[PDB]
Design a protein around this ligand. Sequence first.
Ligand code: 5O1
Length: 258
Amino acid sequence: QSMSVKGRIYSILKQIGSGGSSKVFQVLNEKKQIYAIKYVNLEEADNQTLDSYRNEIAYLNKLQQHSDKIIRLYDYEITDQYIYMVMECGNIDLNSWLKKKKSIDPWERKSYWKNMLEAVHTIHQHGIVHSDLKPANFLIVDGMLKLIDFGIANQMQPDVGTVNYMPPEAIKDMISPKSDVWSLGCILYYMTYGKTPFQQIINQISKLHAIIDPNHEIEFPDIPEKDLQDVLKCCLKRDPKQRISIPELLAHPYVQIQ
Ligand SMILES: COc1cc(-c2cnn(C)c2)ccc1Nc1ncc2ccnc(NC3CCCCC3)c2n1
């Protein structure tokens, strides 16, 4: 099987993942260079979701120049029937990497964190809040973490969702850049303690309650990296006004001092 995108032929090596009407394929161009093609079957798409894809593609194209921490979008084809996006192919997504890894290098964790702050910070500058950040939104490419999507179009899984990274303010509102800080904090906590802050809570209703309860104290076990522990405490503050900002996270010793 092979596909054509803007007159360029790509042979499919394998399907990396499938989400909804969208599929991701590892592919090779004529020169044998590797790429990831995202295929979206628009045949059963509503004007709201169709628009979301248009918005996601526009931002992705727009944010190309601003940061290298955002996945490369080389080309794309849009028709009433389908969408093809030619993107750089990464080794693996951060989620699948974390599920696999028995332990994580302190340097790698710090480097990955920095990449994440840079990518997320970039989208914030353009007025975009992902609001659905999780490890699966990050791709490891060349030992570097890149943001795959901006939370506008539907998420994909390799070949079920989670409320583990949800900020308290999102639950209570029944969403500002601080909401992404909470989620990034949950990712870092996971990379630090091998679990998310509320993973232990099996009962989902209880979990949401734990997330919004001031009296529920998140555990921050002592570790050699005292700066890392402070980052975690500052990202996981329930009051978004008191929660640390990305610009402040970028001036933190944890990311500045080595
Ligand atoms: C080598 O190829 C890959 C393998 C895996 C992998 C390995 N083991 N497991 C369990 C997964 C994950 C990712 C990649 N590479 C990749 N490169 C560019 C992408 C552009 C958009 N979307 C992607 N994947 C979406 C669907 C997959 C999850 C992330 C979102 C992309 N995935």
